[PDB]
Paper text:
[name] virus has two surface glycoproteins, hemagglutinin (HA) and [name] (NA), that act as the major antigens. The natural function of NA is to cleave the sialic acids from cellular receptors to facilitate virus release and from newly synthesized HA to prevent virion aggregation.
Of note, the structure of SD93 NA was determined in complex with zanamivir. Briefly, we constructed a mutant library for SD93 that contained all possible combinations of 10 mutations (n = 210 = 1024 variants), namely E248G, R249K, I265T, Y336H, R338L, N339D, K344E, S346G, E369K, and G381E, in the genetic background of N387K. Mutations E248G, R249K, Y336N, K344E, and E369K were enriched among variants with a frequency of >0.1% in the post-passaged mutant libraries of both biological replicates, suggesting that they could restore the fitness of N387K in SD93.
Numbering used by the authors:
A (entry chain A), B (entry chain A), C (entry chain A), D (entry chain A): 82 to 469
The structure:
Amino acid sequence: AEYRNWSKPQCKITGFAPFSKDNSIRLSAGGDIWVTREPYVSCDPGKCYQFALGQGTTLNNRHSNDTVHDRTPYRTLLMNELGVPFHLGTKQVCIAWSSSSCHDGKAWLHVCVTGHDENATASFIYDGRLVDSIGSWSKNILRTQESECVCINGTCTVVMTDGSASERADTKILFIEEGKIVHISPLSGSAQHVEECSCYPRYPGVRCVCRDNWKGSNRPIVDINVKDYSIVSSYVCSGLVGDTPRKNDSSSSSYCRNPNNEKGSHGVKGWAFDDGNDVWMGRTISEELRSGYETFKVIGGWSKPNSKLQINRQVIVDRGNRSGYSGIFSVEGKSCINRCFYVELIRGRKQETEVWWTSNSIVVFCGTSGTYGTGSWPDGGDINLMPI
Amino acid sequence: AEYRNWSKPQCKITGFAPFSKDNSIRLSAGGDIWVTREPYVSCDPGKCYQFALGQGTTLNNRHSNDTVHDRTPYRTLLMNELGVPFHLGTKQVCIAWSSSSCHDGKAWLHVCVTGHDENATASFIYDGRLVDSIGSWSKNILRTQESECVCINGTCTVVMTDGSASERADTKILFIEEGKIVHISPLSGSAQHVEECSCYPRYPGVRCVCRDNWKGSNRPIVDINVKDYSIVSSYVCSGLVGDTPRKNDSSSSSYCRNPNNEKGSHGVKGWAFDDGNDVWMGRTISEELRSGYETFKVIGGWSKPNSKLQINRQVIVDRGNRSGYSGIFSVEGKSCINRCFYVELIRGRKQETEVWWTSNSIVVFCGTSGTYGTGSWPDGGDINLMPI
Amino acid sequence: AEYRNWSKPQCKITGFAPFSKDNSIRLSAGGDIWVTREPYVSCDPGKCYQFALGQGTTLNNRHSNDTVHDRTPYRTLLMNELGVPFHLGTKQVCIAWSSSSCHDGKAWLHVCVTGHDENATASFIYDGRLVDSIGSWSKNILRTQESECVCINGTCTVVMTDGSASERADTKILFIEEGKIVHISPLSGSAQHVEECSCYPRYPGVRCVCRDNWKGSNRPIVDINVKDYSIVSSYVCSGLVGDTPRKNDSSSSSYCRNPNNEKGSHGVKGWAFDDGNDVWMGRTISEELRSGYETFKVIGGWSKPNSKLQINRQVIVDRGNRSGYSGIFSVEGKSCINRCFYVELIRGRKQETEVWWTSNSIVVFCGTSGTYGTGSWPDGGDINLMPI
Amino acid sequence: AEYRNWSKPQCKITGFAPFSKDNSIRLSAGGDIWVTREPYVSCDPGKCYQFALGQGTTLNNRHSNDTVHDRTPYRTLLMNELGVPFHLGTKQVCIAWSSSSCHDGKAWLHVCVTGHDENATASFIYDGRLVDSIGSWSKNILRTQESECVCINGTCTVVMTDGSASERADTKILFIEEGKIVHISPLSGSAQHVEECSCYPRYPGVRCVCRDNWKGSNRPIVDINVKDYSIVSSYVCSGLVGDTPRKNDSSSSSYCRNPNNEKGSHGVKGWAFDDGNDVWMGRTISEELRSGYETFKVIGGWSKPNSKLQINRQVIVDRGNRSGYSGIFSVEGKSCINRCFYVELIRGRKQETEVWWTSNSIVVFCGTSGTYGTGSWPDGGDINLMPI
Ligand SMILES: *[C@@H]1O[C@H](CO)[C@@H](O[C@@H]2O[C@H](CO)[C@@H](O[C@@H]3O[C@H](CO[C@H]4O[C@H](CO)[C@@H](O)[C@H](O)[C@@H]4O)[C@@H](O)[C@H](O[C@H]4O[C@H](CO)[C@@H](O)[C@H](O)[C@@H]4O[C@H]4O[C@H](CO)[C@@H](O)[C@H](O)[C@@H]4O)[C@@H]3O)[C@H](O)[C@H]2NC(C)=O)[C@H](O)[C@H]1NC(C)=O
Ligand SMILES: *[C@@H]1O[C@H](CO)[C@@H](O[C@@H]2O[C@H](CO)[C@@H](O[C@@H]3O[C@H](CO[C@H]4O[C@H](CO)[C@@H](O)[C@H](O)[C@@H]4O)[C@@H](O)[C@H](O[C@H]4O[C@H](CO)[C@@H](O)[C@H](O)[C@@H]4O[C@H]4O[C@H](CO)[C@@H](O)[C@H](O)[C@@H]4O)[C@@H]3O)[C@H](O)[C@H]2NC(C)=O)[C@H](O)[C@H]1NC(C)=O
Ligand SMILES: *[C@@H]1O[C@H](CO)[C@@H](O[C@@H]2O[C@H](CO)[C@@H](O[C@@H]3O[C@H](CO[C@H]4O[C@H](CO)[C@@H](O)[C@H](O)[C@@H]4O)[C@@H](O)[C@H](O[C@H]4O[C@H](CO)[C@@H](O)[C@H](O)[C@@H]4O[C@H]4O[C@H](CO)[C@@H](O)[C@H](O)[C@@H]4O)[C@@H]3O)[C@H](O)[C@H]2NC(C)=O)[C@H](O)[C@H]1NC(C)=O
Ligand SMILES: *[C@@H]1O[C@H](CO)[C@@H](O[C@@H]2O[C@H](CO)[C@@H](O[C@@H]3O[C@H](CO[C@H]4O[C@H](CO)[C@@H](O)[C@H](O)[C@@H]4O)[C@@H](O)[C@H](O[C@H]4O[C@H](CO)[C@@H](O)[C@H](O)[C@@H]4O[C@H]4O[C@H](CO)[C@@H](O)[C@H](O)[C@@H]4O)[C@@H]3O)[C@H](O)[C@H]2NC(C)=O)[C@H](O)[C@H]1NC(C)=O
Ligand SMILES: *[C@@H]1O[C@H](CO)[C@@H](O[C@@H]2O[C@H](CO)[C@@H](O)[C@H](O)[C@H]2NC(C)=O)[C@H](O)[C@H]1NC(C)=O
Ligand SMILES: *[C@@H]1O[C@H](CO)[C@@H](O[C@@H]2O[C@H](CO)[C@@H](O)[C@H](O)[C@H]2NC(C)=O)[C@H](O)[C@H]1NC(C)=O
Ligand SMILES: *[C@@H]1O[C@H](CO)[C@@H](O[C@@H]2O[C@H](CO)[C@@H](O)[C@H](O)[C@H]2NC(C)=O)[C@H](O)[C@H]1NC(C)=O
Ligand SMILES: *[C@@H]1O[C@H](CO)[C@@H](O[C@@H]2O[C@H](CO)[C@@H](O)[C@H](O)[C@H]2NC(C)=O)[C@H](O)[C@H]1NC(C)=O
Ligand SMILES: CC(=O)N[C@H]1[C@H]([C@H](O)[C@H](O)CO)OC(C(=O)O)=C[C@@H]1NC(=N)N
Ligand SMILES: CC(=O)N[C@H]1[C@H]([C@H](O)[C@H](O)CO)OC(C(=O)O)=C[C@@H]1NC(=N)N
Ligand SMILES: CC(=O)N[C@H]1[C@H]([C@H](O)[C@H](O)CO)OC(C(=O)O)=C[C@@H]1NC(=N)N
Ligand SMILES: CC(=O)N[C@H]1[C@H]([C@H](O)[C@H](O)CO)OC(C(=O)O)=C[C@@H]1NC(=N)N
Ligand SMILES: [Ca+2]
Ligand SMILES: [Ca+2]
Ligand SMILES: [Ca+2]
Ligand SMILES: [Ca+2]
């Protein structure tokens, strides 16, 4: 077992091909399935796992009532092989209402945040044991990525924020070796609010695309140097912006450096990645709600401010159907590093009042150098047939 | 771990012996069990797995209503060790309403087709990662074997069709190395319609027996050369024909080359294999419906046009009970390659209107060089005791 | 991985200590648990597994009605790690209404009998593949041990019977190498009826204690020489006899050679083993019914005809509670071979008419060279609280 | 695989960080989950497992009625990976109404006590086989730790008691090598009543902190020398005492040697460990009931009689919520041995009469050298929403 270095070129990407779907809401109506939100995917050198924050209950269960809330002492991080739905034999790997996980080539790191809003604790669990912890620095909901961290040569990086959801906050990037925090770098650069980073290896460093919850509907970028620990930050250049809410495609803007101040408050976790001058990105189809999901390439979208020249659109979830969070993960192939993404498909309250609970299923796609057609892969639960 | 070459002689076969049964419909009445159809069996060098296309629901579940339909975005390929029924802890290995899987000696390949009828995508997943994809070439339900593919020296072959179910279509044979499509050969030869191939290693190549959905109640043969990529095709010589529907045993014919034009439209997935001049084959007992299942050898049935000299009949499922799809798989023994087969036992709509769902169980037999008796191994669900 | 030779002395035994219990009937009232009978235990070099013949249904299931019957096409052999109850994720390793399993040091052999009463088939499955089969020789319920077979230096032995349950029958001992039948020896010697043998390694050969269903309430012994394939047989010398039904302890007899002709018809699977001149044995406490279970040593019970000098009695199941089948298994320790046994605890019809089903749980004890106390470990299901 | 020696220094501890929670009571209301009590945690060199004494039933099950009782023949020791709740696929590793388990670096030892109150048997199971047993010496509820044993260089130690719960009893320390009892040392020293020891490696020996059920609300210490087999004992010096019941913090006392005679009768399993002159310890917040759970360091609490100088308090379970048993486990890191603890969260009768059953969930924390905040992690079941 050697440490991952991710020192291969990024794979050619012509778009994305179907990879996985768990259909967990449909199954919940005829089986004991965990209530979840904030899912993600991360893979060890051999195989992929799906993760989510449990609500400490199954769906067909009186405890599922009012599971819309984000933070309780009963939330734990679930971990199954990808494609295995969260049944009662699912392992809860730590106590968490915010998490990030990654494999360094040798073992799994889990970063798990729980406790009081005003004084939370993050535990660092590596190779099945607790190695480190840190208390809240700003005493206002310490929180992390809700997707995979990234490790190079045994140094794993994870982005965490503490402080306001609607003003300047204190974001820090932790460097972790075999579960031990060896360095913490405060955020630097021009990103003005950073949450829920979707990070990927871009040898020799790590690159993240995140959520600005304050003034931006354009997505922040954070670049992390694992050798000198320097942090830089800015915004995705693309004038087709990635956050929800946002303005329409003709009114939206981004000039690469500053929050656009266009329906900037609130947000959704999302992702994008660079290919030379171009960007690949996903987003909800709706500009207001977490409904629909589309991916596309913006020509010049990485290096040219405010570019809106799109190509290679794919519908992942049709506009009539609910989506949610999305995030990136990276998979090492024979000769290149591939980029994949998941979409959380949220069902229940508050939007759907037919039931009392709030949960999600997942759908997953991976980059391809081949060809593909079209479809739509929504949750598929019939809200009127569900246990309430 | 070395690549499979399958370079051993075929085992002596005197008939088939019971190997596995999952009883999943009976269990569905008292437990959370997936709704499935189109099952199959494939084995790695150590052990066998059962596969099926899920309907994204369990049977005792309101979502099981009207699961007769062939293609939805909720269908996924299930994979368990053979004999483990599709319980809620079953892994969904990809999104699929048509699939083929095989192990090359080192890792599993899955071929999975999903998306719009008119523009489907096939994903190629090898060793737990997406390696390739292809879009629909004829824009009319791209589809594949619904049974195991076959790999020799690391080249895996899979037969796919796109186009009409009731006229000339575009069948292609893909050659896949570690999940990457390295070559695609169009169908050639005298088979006029080819679907749902049951393929087996016949060193140095691959041989398939398939479904003609158009003009043949005789089964097509496709031979695949993995070195020069040439394809040839014809029909099983046996005058006792293998498809359903078909004419009676006295009226039926085949002359080895052309569809017989005898109740040729429609069909069922099935199998046959050669032993010198003789053929072993299975088929439904009913000539009209997917009811009963019998196996036998036809003396001269491989090389003599229209031979009807049968011997070594076995009843697998009595004529009063429902069958369905069937297919071949191959298992490497100490000194020879054995041939085995599964039978899908379909229950529910449209034939049985007592329930709203459509599902199946499975029964599995393997070739033997020993002796055996008689029996009948049907599904065993009591349609009047089932959840509706 | 080397073949087991079992070439160590038998461990010192002062009695038996509790090893396992699965409590499956109690669990069946609040969970999806298989309906079973005829359970047994066998261990690979590392760990033990529990086995049973399923009835192709869970208990809380309409299909559990009238599961008293011995033989159906839905019965399969279940296999879990010992102590894991037969939940819905349990593997069905073959189709069987009669079975025997054993590990040769390298891999598992399963012997599985299914099909028509008058023309059954036994499949031989080794290392996950079908290697051999044999048809019924006497056309009257081919059947086997319902407990572990035994392998020495890669030759596995299994005792099978075909023919009358109430007159002279045709018993044969099969010698099996990597799943292939290499030799079959007919029963020889003075045992007049032999069923359901409980066999154990007694280097350099195999020794079995069985059920006489015809004229004996004394238990037959069959000795198997794995080098020259010779079979000899007689009866356990002990005047305290092991079968049910039987006469009382003062009226019972055995003189080592012939069936005692004392309430000889019918029987129950059971076990005994030798220690020099002494015998260890178990039996039901009731002389008429399968109720209670006791173990003891008979001083002189192996070599002295009709000895009744007992010592070291233990109650395993109190006389007020139901038992059933019992059988031996052997476990290799550091320096000796230990002997253990299981007891099937049968619940339901026909004896208990409060429910419609027939099932069992299990309890397991192992020989000890240490000390122990007393107890009683019955099924524990409350028949009046069970699903019907 | 080498034997554990635990020959590293104890880790720096500044307090404890969240590690695991299973939420099993909440899940029990919508899924088949075992009824348990007396849980614990023990880890092999790679990963941690959770253990508990089952009641031979799931919670949503008529057999769960009146599961308040401590000892039945249906109780078994359950073992899952830590964080996997006790679902129906959980392994029952032995028959037990009292247990201790530990891994010696090569294999698992289980110590399991069952049978009649007046004549119980303890089985010693190592590497999946029964190696030894001992009968009750004092004929009055032979019993053990209900938490992990400890092994050094292949010698495992376990503390057992037989005799009165309310007067002088017969405690013995067993030394076990590969499952075989090689030596038994009677308790010696000034501890006057010793039950339910929480033991940890303190190279070159083993140290335990236990429950005095008779005259002490201060906790006994037992030190075990694994080389010369000598036993010494006393009481934790801290004037803030660890048992429940106890007097208030101002009235309580301990002078290190003798039971304090302060509300000494009854007790709860608990833990403490030394760091030079200081002690870390947990206890219920309530002085009368098993409610709340707090941890803290007492400065001088190991070596200075009656010290009450506390620092580094953490609330684990708020005072309004139920706790129960607690115990220590040790985890080997890169350069030091860490100390962790679990808390049993008891729900149901007799305290909560809304339901008929008695069960528990668990929460687990590990020592940290980092920082942390605050929270409360109670069971979380709504007693008014539970199946009864
Ligand atoms: C079977 O499946 C395949 C694979 O999914 C699918 O092919 C894909 O089709 C989509 C939709 O057409 C393609 O994505 C589009 O790409 C165009 C640019 O490509 C065209 O123009 C260039 C340059 O001239 C040519 O080289 C090229 O050949 C094409 O002709 C983008 O313009 C598209 O974006 C617009 O349309 C979207 C809706 O489709 C809008 O959502 C989006 O906002 C854009 O609209 C606005 O921008 C336009 C200018 O960009 C302008 O007209 C207005 O401002 C407008 O309002 C979109 O990204 C994708 O590349 C194809 N994939 C591949 C690999 O070929 C097949 O269509 C499908 N067949 C069926 C019937 O199912
Ligand atoms: C216990 O279990 C064993 C194993 O399953 C079983 O033995 C098997 O019996 C079946 C049924 O008889 C055998 O299969 C048949 O084989 C004959 C040919 O074999 C005979 O003829 C040759 C050549 O002269 C002899 O060497 C040989 O010894 C036999 O006498 C086929 O003719 C059979 O096919 C016909 O009958 C079927 C129904 O059984 C029809 O479905 C089928 O359509 C065929 O019917 C038509 O063809 C006939 C000419 O072929 C002619 O009469 C008419 O056209 C007719 O309508 C069938 O394949 C099988 O070989 C045996 N297996 C072995 C290994 O021996 C025992 O019977 C069983 N016992 C019981 C009581 O359960
Ligand atoms: C705590 O747990 C331990 C371990 O389980 C338990 O000890 C065991 O007790 C049983 C029951 O007494 C013992 O088994 C009996 O052994 C005697 C022979 O031993 C005695 O005699 C010899 C020779 O003189 C002495 O060396 C020895 O010290 C003993 O005194 C057998 O006779 C017993 O069989 C008879 O009684 C059974 C009921 O207990 C009947 O079911 C059985 O049919 C026998 O009855 C008939 O035979 C008698 C002559 O054999 C005669 O009296 C009449 O014919 C009669 O009707 C039985 O096998 C066992 O050896 C002990 N185990 C060990 C290791 O010591 C403790 O008793 C237990 N304590 C409590 C209170 O729970
Ligand atoms: C965010 O999260 C952090 C980490 O959990 C938390 O910090 C921790 O706070 C607790 C509670 O204050 C600290 O534990 C206490 O420590 C004091 C001793 O520390 C003080 O005094 C020393 C010596 O002068 C100073 O060096 C040091 O800086 C501190 O000022 C103990 O006295 C505390 O025990 C008493 O209070 C408890 C309730 O909090 C009682 O339950 C307990 O019985 C004690 O009460 C009695 O004793 C007193 C003297 O000891 C005396 O006043 C009376 O007799 C009294 O009745 C307690 O152990 C802990 O050390 C902090 N942890 C760290 C690592 O700093 C933050 O508070 C938290 N913030 C929020 C708002 O959530
Ligand atoms: C995209 O949003 C812009 C900005 O709101 C829309 O432009 C406005 O449209 C209304 C008429 O519907 C006018 O009264 C306003 O003067 C416009 N505002 C500005 C600032 O231009 C535009 O219509 C939207 N485009 C689409 C296609 O919906
Ligand atoms: C097999 O099918 C053939 C073809 O239909 C049947 O032959 C027909 O039988 C009817 C009488 O029932 C006659 O009126 C027709 O003239 C026949 N047609 C031909 C073309 O021969 C034959 O009877 C069937 N055999 C069996 C055993 O059912
Ligand atoms: C054991 O069984 C024998 C054989 O039946 C019993 O002896 C019989 O008892 C009855 C009186 O109850 C007499 O009328 C018969 O003459 C006896 N028959 C013989 C052949 O002796 C004996 O009583 C039984 N022993 C016990 C303890 O139940
Ligand atoms: C702790 O317990 C002590 C001992 O009972 C309490 O002291 C008693 O308090 C009552 C008044 O409430 C007096 O009448 C007794 O004289 C006291 N007894 C002794 C022996 O001192 C003390 O009040 C308790 N402390 C707290 C904070 O509850
Ligand atoms: C720690 C926490 O509660 N994070 C929140 C997150 C957060 O409110 C925003 O990013 C603003 O800061 O929003 C959302 C959301 O759906 O918008 C869900 C997350 N829920 C959970 N991770 N549990
Ligand atoms: C891709 C697809 O829908 N294939 C069909 C197949 C097909 O309709 C015929 O071969 C004609 O082309 O028929 C059947 C069938 O039962 O006849 C089931 C298959 N269902 C699934 N594989 N899902
Ligand atoms: C193959 C078969 O049916 N064997 C029978 C067995 C048999 O009837 C007797 O030994 C007489 O021959 O009896 C019993 C029994 O409980 O007495 C159960 C077995 N049931 C099963 N193994 N399924
Ligand atoms: C063997 C046994 O029954 N031990 C008891 C234990 C015991 O009563 C006291 O320590 C007094 O001796 O108390 C308790 C308790 O909750 O106080 C539970 C234990 N239950 C179980 N381990 N099953
Ligand atoms: Ca925003
Ligand atoms: Ca056809
Ligand atoms: Ca008999
Ligand atoms: Ca006490």
